Amino acid sequence: HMTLTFNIKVIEAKDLPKVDTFGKVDPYVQIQLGNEKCKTKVIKKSYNPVWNETFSIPVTNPKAPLNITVVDYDFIGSNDAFAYIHFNQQEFNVGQVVDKWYMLNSYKAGRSAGQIHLVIHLATQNMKPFE
């Protein structure tokens, strides 16, 4: 198959900042590739959340940037994104499994946003995800 898919495992994050009104942070991760968006579950009150959630996103637009954001779920207000990492799709080679910790960028400069642990595998449709 010629159609490519981004297989992304959102494993965990560490050292997230305190951003929620009623304590710590309630983090989830949103993955954006063009018009395609998906998100993890919310982990309650955790600076070192572990999600272990896997996504498979088809590449229909080869120019869309891959944008990964960490967001604080607010049960009584707007959910505020506080950190991101973004990639050109060509930063990943077809067939390569990249298992890495990334330093998160804070939207508000000068604050630490922690790190995120992702497995990213740009794959053809029959390749076993992450293998």
Domain boundaries, the chain: 4-124
SS3 25: coil
Question: What pairing do the DSSP bridges indicate for beta strands 27-33 and 66-72?
Answer: antiparallel
User: Using CA atoms, how far apart are residues 121 and 110, in angstroms rounded to an integer?
Assistant: 31
Give this entry's resolution in angstroms. 1.7
User: Using CA atoms, how far apart are residues 88 and 85, in angstroms rounded to an integer?
Assistant: 11
Residue 84 β-bridge partners: 69, 105
Instruction: Tell whether domain 4-124 is in CATH 2.60.120.330.
Output: no
